[PDB]
Amino acid sequence: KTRKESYAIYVYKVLKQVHPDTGISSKAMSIMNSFVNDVFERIAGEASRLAHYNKRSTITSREIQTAVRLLLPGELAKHAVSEGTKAVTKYTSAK
Amino acid sequence: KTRKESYAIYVYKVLKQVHPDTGISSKAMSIMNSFVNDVFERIAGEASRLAHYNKRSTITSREIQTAVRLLLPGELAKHAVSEGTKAVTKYTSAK
Amino acid sequence: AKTRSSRAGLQFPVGRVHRLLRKGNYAERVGAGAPVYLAAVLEYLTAEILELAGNAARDNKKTRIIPRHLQLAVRNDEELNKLLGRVTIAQGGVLPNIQSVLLPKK
Amino acid sequence: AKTRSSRAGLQFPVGRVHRLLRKGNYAERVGAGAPVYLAAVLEYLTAEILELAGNAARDNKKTRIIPRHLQLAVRNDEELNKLLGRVTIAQGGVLPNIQSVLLPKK
Amino acid sequence: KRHRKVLRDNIQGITKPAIRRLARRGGVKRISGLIYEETRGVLKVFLENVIRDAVTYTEHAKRKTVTAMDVVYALKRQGRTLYGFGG
Amino acid sequence: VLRDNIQGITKPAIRRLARRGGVKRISGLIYEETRGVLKVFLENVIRDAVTYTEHAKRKTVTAMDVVYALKRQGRTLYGFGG
Amino acid sequence: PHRYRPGTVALREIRRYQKSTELLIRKLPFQRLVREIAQDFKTDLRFQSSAVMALQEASEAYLVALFEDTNLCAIHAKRVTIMPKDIQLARRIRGE
Amino acid sequence: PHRYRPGTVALREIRRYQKSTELLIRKLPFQRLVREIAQDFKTDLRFQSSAVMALQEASEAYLVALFEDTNLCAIHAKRVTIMPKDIQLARRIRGE
DNA sequence: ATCAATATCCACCTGCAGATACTACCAAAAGTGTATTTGGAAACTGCTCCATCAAAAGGCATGTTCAGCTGATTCAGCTGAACATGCCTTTTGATGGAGCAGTTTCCAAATACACTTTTGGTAGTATCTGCAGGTGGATATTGAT
DNA sequence: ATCAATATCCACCTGCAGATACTACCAAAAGTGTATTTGGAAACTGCTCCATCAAAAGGCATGTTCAGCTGAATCAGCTGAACATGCCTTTTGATGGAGCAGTTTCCAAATACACTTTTGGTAGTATCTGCAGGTGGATATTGAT
Ligand SMILES: [Mg+2]
């Protein structure tokens, strides 16, 4: 009865953080789900190519970060990089 | 020092099959090389996607063929498929 | 047993993102930081688009975001619009916009 | 020892192509025919262009093919042109073409 | 078992009214009377390309049924990415 | 004669580009529009090539940095590698 | 018997259709067109309904955008009336 | 005392440059523009001699093709003189 | 018309940049053979959802009428094309040294794996609520006069 | 200006499908804690080829002049918008089964070393030639008359 995965519960968490009294339709969620898969693939792709280009075989946060600078426009990139740098910093601090 | 690979010799060989008395400049060869890599990446890329869509771990000649169909315009696709199906045959029918 | 998401401060699921990176065949190996960073980026972005969609929801006296609110949000934001410039949001409509000369009289 | 190219009837390097596919992270695995097929496909396309570029050299009193010939070849063929519709051949210029309304009165 | 009716000329189900609605959503005030056939022709080309590619995916997977993913993937190749249907 | 760099792209050379593009007559405001446009093209592409440079930890922008940038901007160029 | 002048209903319709998001081609006719064209590529094909809906959403968005561009080509020509030449110039410039 | 008519040289130039492929911008002023621009994203920067060439081939291919579309936009407006609005329209339609 | 200025052509000549050809050499592929692993076609069949087919429901086709838009015609002015006459920038080549690319080391971070815990999805039965479509009532916009 | 036909507004009002809410259940995901491998950083280094600059090379800046284009204004013919009318197709909701997708079986084909062979790239040399860039001289093209 095979199980279909989606980012819905995460999307919903985050919805609540920014607009606590606001809901989302299932059609509007399918879209948010498209959106996340989409950007995932694009960034992962950019990083894929980027590693190959530099004969690296490992995709790290450094490759993600660049992929982000390449893919996103100015302000979104700057903010996205903060959040990525700081999530990593913080995750590394569990050690 | 490092071995800088190209398809240049294999291109030159085909030039002489097709135009035995015609030769080619360096720049022109570089463009031909670009071209072969490009088409390579495009086809392989499309094959990768296909396999992923159907939850397969292997890129076979079927994936390359569908890839070809998807990438090339009509007539070109047609001759390319025949040339591919052919070369696979000679190869199996050959110890 | 801490999740990696908690460890990194994230709502979005790092374990999953790691998994999905491995199975996508983007590279032989996948660094430990990668899915953390990527999950953060993805979380950031969904937060941006919900902020803005939430507002259009509110601007239209509604409480539940539908795809029109996403389309309003995306298209009225220079940068999201560009990021999503070759993308279609089903059931989004278009921005109201009438070219000047088309309007009546002077 | 017989090469797979020679087994397949081909001038283009089946082994290389195989290697390139493994190291491209296109998929976990690679079947045996795929390199053969792909290699035949690239040989074929290569030939189609050199045929037409060769002709283009002839048509200009030339025995050496240069970028210019590859460009005339490609942009004068509906199919190659489409395949290459988003590609720029360095040092190829453009096709002689002038919009008819720009001609003088005759 | 018993035989699916013939399909012809369905392009004309894209009515003058419905095209005019599309034009409106697209901000258009006045419409030359030759637009309706032109539009029909341009739509037909759009669909043949998306469908060719979709059906290629269908067959590649040895199915008889064209799925929403087949179309979504074909749209992506064509650079007309669509959200809402399995993206 | 301290001159701006964009202006180094001169009226006659713009005029020759247009000619290759089949253009017969050219309005005087073109040369400035045309420089504006080329600046945008180059910002967009150089940004990405450089970003490739920085990634590889180089001080030198390679042809590959450029070719790769061109490629992802949809402007695949043939003849300089890759 | 009142009469709106030419253009006035048109502007009304523009405001209306730009505010809504419902599909504008009738569903069943569109579905037939899909089946007809698919059948010409291959026979004994079936479709998920959401596949047809996907095609319609994609098709309608493409055309609406095409008319925006088309409208801009008419206006460039100092007209207010879209003509085939406008659609064709759009499609030439777009790369189609 | 002999003078070519306005447009006659334009044509001769059109034919001459369509025949050829040499680049049409002086290499040096180009080189400075590039480096000027690149400076805003990183300082103390060298460039392979081929890297700059790639960039010039691309820019010229781009601008030449933009001029074709631009020209089509002028002709569309029943003109023969390219104007800034013609370039703007072409860029708008291309999606820039 | 003719007539002359200038562009364009075709034939022939040549020097050397760019291409072919050499060989040697040698590392790193590509081929081979053996041992091991696993992906995915096949056979079988549970179960979704597609094609198909009546009961409800609002959009389409056509002809008539005329408002106003397009496109043809005219015309004056200003704006680019052409070209002379100076100005000065770019291109070409030579020559140190910055940095890129080669290479080797060794360890922090990777994959591998087994085993234990947690989670996110689904299913089933639950009751919960935003807003669309309806209502009516006050106001706005349009177009004739 | 005024009047009046009709769209537009907005506000609140009822029904219900779509959302939310819940407990029960589990497979697969994800975390944890070992054993084992290595990718790529670090640090030193040789050698391009890049920035620099001085000598040689020709293109671009300017101003004057006027041909011919753009755009304004005027007009008529005619195309396309609006609307009234009559006819029926699309939308929507309920069953029977075609095909897709979830199992399990298993072998033909894939990976994984290790091992032998070869070929494609580079470097050192030498060797060669297609054709760009002069040439002259004939003829076409353009533009004035
Ligand atoms: Mg048919």
CA distance A94 to B9: 55
Tell which residue, D9, D35, D31, has the closest CA to residue D20. Answer: D35
Cβ of B23: how many Cβ atoms within 10 Å? Answer: 15
Which residue in chain F has the smallest CA separation from B41?
F82
How many CB atoms lie under 10 A from the CB of residue H35? 16
Which helix (H) or strand (E) segment holds residue E31: the answer is strand E30-31
Chain B interface, Cβ < 8 Å to F: 27, 30-31, 34-35, 37-38
Q: Which of D46, A57, D22, B4 is nearest to F81 (CA)?
A: B4
Distance, CA of E54 to CA of G37 (rounded, Å): 12
Q: Do E25 and C67 touch (CB under 8 A)?
A: no
Q: Å from C9 to nearest chain A CA?
A: 6
CA/C1' separation D59–I34 (Å): 57
Residues A11-24 as b or e (16 or more Cβ within 10 Å = b): bbebbeebbeebbb
Method by which the coordinates were obtained:
X-ray
Q: What's the gap in Å between E71 CA and the centre of ligand 1?
A: 20
Hunting for tokens 């995916």 — which residue is that?
E57
Structural domain including F19 reads 1-82
Query: Each residue of A45-74: b (16+ CB within 10 Å) or e?
Result: bbbbbbbbeeebeebbbbbbbbbbbbbbee
For chain B, what's the residue count?
Answer: 95
Could you tell me if A22 and C54 are in contact, meaning their C-beta atoms sit under 8 angstroms apart? yes
Annotate H59-93 with b (16+ C-beta within 10 A) or e (fewer): bbbbbbbbbbbbbbbbbbbebbebbbbbbbbbbeb
CB D31 within 7 Å, strand J: yes
Residues with C-beta atoms within 5 A of ion ligand 1: G 40
Q: Does A95 touch chain C (CB under 8 A)?
A: no
Q: Give the chain C residue nearest D28 (alpha carbons).
A: C25
Amino acid at F65: D
Residue A49 in contact with partner chain D when CB distance is under 8 A: no
A35/E81 Cβ within 8 A: no
Residue range of the domain that includes B79: 1-95
Sequence-distant (6+) residues with CB within 8 A of H32 are F5, F8
Could you say which DSSP state residue C90 is in?
T
Residue D99 with chain F: CB contacts under 8 Å: 22
Q: How many domains, chain E? A: 1
Q: Best interface-test mutation with F: which of D88, D95, D99 has the largest number of F CBs within 10 A? A: D88
Ligand 1 center to G36 CA (angstroms): 6
C-alpha closest to that of H33 among G90, G65, F12, F45 = F45
CA of E44 from ligand 1 middle (Å) equals: 13
- Cα–Cα distance measured from residue H51 to residue C28, given in angstroms and rounded to the nearest whole number: 30
Which has the closest alpha carbon to D73: D50, D93, D41, D91?
A: D50
**Pick from B59, B83, B85: CB nearest D34:** B59
The per-residue DSSP string of C6-20 comes to HHHT-SS-HHHHHHH
Query: Of chain G residues 55-74, which have a beta carbon within 7 Å of strand J?
Result: none
**Total H helices, total E strands in chain B:** 4, 2
Look at residues G93, A58, A8 and name the one whose alpha carbon lies nearest to residue H71: G93
Task: Answer yes or no: do A31 and C89 touch at CB < 8 A.
Answer: yes
Q: What is the enclosing helix (H) or strand (E) of F7?
A: none
Name residue C62's amino acid.
K
Q: Do A53 and F72 touch (CB under 8 A)?
A: no
**At D15, which helix (H) or strand (E)?**
helix D14-22
H abuts F (3+ Cβ pairs < 8 Å): yes
Task: For H46-70, give the DSSP string.
Answer: EE-HHHHHHHHHHHHHHHHHHHHHH
Instruction: Specify the CATH number for the domain of residue F8.
Output: 1.10.20.10
- Structural domains in chain B (count): 1
CA E65 / ligand 1 centre spacing (Å): 18
Determine, for residues H76 and G92 on separate chains, whether the beta-carbon distance falls below 8 Å: no
> How many residues are present in chain G?
96
DSSP D61: T
SS3 state of residue G47: strand
**Protein CA at A21 to nucleotide C1' at I116, angstroms:** 39
Q: What is the distance between the alpha carbons of residues B65 and B73, in angstroms, rounded to a whole number?
A: 13
Q: Any idea what DSSP says for residue D100?
A: G
Resolution in A: 2.6
Q: From the CA of E67, how far away is ligand 1's center (Å)?
A: 21
Domain ranges (residues) in chain C? 1-106
> Which residue from H72, H92, H95 is facing G92, i.e. has the nearest CB?
H72
- Domains of chain G with CATH codes: 1-96 (1.10.20.10)
Which has the closest alpha carbon to E81: G32, G62, B27? G62
Closest CB from F22, F78, F80 relative to D97: F22
What proportions of chain A, in percent to the nearest 5, are helix, strand and coil? 75, 5, 25
CATH superfamily of D1-106: Histone, subunit A (1.10.20.10)
**CATH code for the domain in which residue A24 is found:** 1.10.20.10
In F1-82, the DSSP E strands lie at 25-26, 60-61, 76-78
